């Protein structure tokens, strides 16, 4: 392994992703849900980084 690989991995699997909404605009007639979506959250504990 190389330090560049470590940096690439830590960049890749510790990130923030914007997904969107379920039932966004413009909608189709006959819709009744306007929830949001959560995709990925930054790591918090040291074990997760481990």
């Amino acid at each position: 392994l190389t330090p560049v690989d470590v940096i690439t991995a830590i960049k890749a699997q510790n990130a923030q992703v914007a997904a969107g909404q379920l039932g966004g605009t413009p909608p189709v007639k006959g819709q009744q849900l306007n929830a949001s979506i959560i995709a990925q959250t930054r790591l918090t504990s040291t074990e997760e980084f481990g």
Binding site: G23, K29, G30, Q32, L33
Partner: protein, 49 residues
């Protein structure tokens, strides 16, 4: 001495008289708001409006 009580009634009045800052005037244009339960859709609020 009678004039004396003319003073004290003033205090009695000061309790009766409430306090505000600025009256509400007739501007001729007003507003109305509509708020719906969470998770609703645009069609429902459009129909209500």
């Amino acid at each position: 001495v009678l004039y004396l009580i003319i003073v004290v009634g003033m205090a009695y009045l000061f309790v009766r008289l409430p306090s505000s800052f600025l009256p509400d005037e007739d501007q001729g244009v007003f507003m109305t708001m509509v708020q719906l339960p969470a998770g609703a859709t645009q069609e429902r609020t459009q129909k209500v409006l």
